[PDB]
Design a protein around this ligand. Sequence first.
Ligand SMILES: CSC[C@H]1O[C@@H](n2cnc3c(N)ncnc32)[C@H](O)[C@@H]1O
Ligand SMILES: CSC[C@H]1O[C@@H](n2cnc3c(N)ncnc32)[C@H](O)[C@@H]1O
Ligand SMILES: [Zn+2]
Ligand SMILES: [Zn+2]
Lengths: 180, 182
Amino acid sequence: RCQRCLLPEKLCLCSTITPAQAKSRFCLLMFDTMKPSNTGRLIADILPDTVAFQWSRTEPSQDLLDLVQNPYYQPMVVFPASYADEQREVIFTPPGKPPLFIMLDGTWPEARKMFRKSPYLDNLPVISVDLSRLSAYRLRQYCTAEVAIALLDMAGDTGAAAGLGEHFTRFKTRYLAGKT
Amino acid sequence: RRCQRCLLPEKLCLCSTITPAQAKSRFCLLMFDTMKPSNTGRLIADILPDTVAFQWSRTEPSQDLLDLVQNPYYQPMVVFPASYADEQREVIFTPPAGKPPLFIMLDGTWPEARKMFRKSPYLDNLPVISVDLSRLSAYRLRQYCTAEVAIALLDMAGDTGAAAGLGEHFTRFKTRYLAGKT
Ligand SMILES: CSC[C@H]1O[C@@H](n2cnc3c(N)ncnc32)[C@H](O)[C@@H]1O
Ligand SMILES: CSC[C@H]1O[C@@H](n2cnc3c(N)ncnc32)[C@H](O)[C@@H]1O
Ligand SMILES: [Zn+2]
Ligand SMILES: [Zn+2]
């Protein structure tokens, strides 16, 4: 197995990676800090400015707090609108200020716990994802990578959205064939 | 649900990725019947579109096939393991210089290629070329199928650009063929 791409050495895709540029930026809030089937790591392959943090219940990192409170960005929590309280601001599109998409990586019981017990995210708006936009990139819950492609298209980053789609498709195919 | 041109599930269609190459060598596929997706001889035509294919016949060979294996513009070779040749049969381990090579492939199952090798009087005066398969290492590829053999022959003839192009195309097909199988 390759160590960079985690695919068996006969199926390495590291030679095919070509990054794209986007006005949007991603922040990965990880619960365990990686398994080969985790799709959030594919985002950094196409957008190397992606930042990642290990989630902590008691003591959040000072690097993380300085980012979500940086007025340069318009931060927003990416989580389905059904899970939000009646007073929580919910939006359906990313507004001038470049978005900072905060993803909650992990299984659904863990992403719910991260959503419910992080006081530093409670004043941020929630963005509900229009997954219908995956049709324009010929893609069919939905993993962290598929949601990211929809967000890039929602913000006008078509070049980066198309790139992540071909890279994600390239990975899924070599992953299935590696099981054979 | 399956693409008609590449014979893979439409979600794994690779037709948009095909880029042809150019080579001094030419291929002639002698086939036993008409297609199963795991048959690899068609990948050669994707990268070298001047490939010609004929249906084998025990009684009446075609005149397009007979005129081509007697056209003195080419140097024709029967691609077959030398172990099955008569002791008087000329055997070679490299394509000669000058005249461009014309590789005659016997595509089918090993009982079918053996029958064609013995019952074709129009092929018996031609030399048998023995393929050097260790050349597949230069293309990161590990008997073998028809397409794998053709990559070696291209390398023996000095057509490295086309040998590499067919290398990617073969790996692409095999990867997407295994994935859609699961
Ligand atoms: C493996 S959990 C997938 C993650 O992607 C994001 N996500 C997935 N589906 C949705 C959705 N329908 N709406 C908003 N965010 C989502 C959330 O960050 C979630 O924790
Ligand atoms: C019978 S299907 C195998 C295909 O690979 C070719 N092939 C496999 N091994 C050899 C070999 N050792 N010498 C020549 N052709 C071979 C065959 O001629 C046919 O095209
Ligand atoms: Zn790799
Ligand atoms: Zn196709």
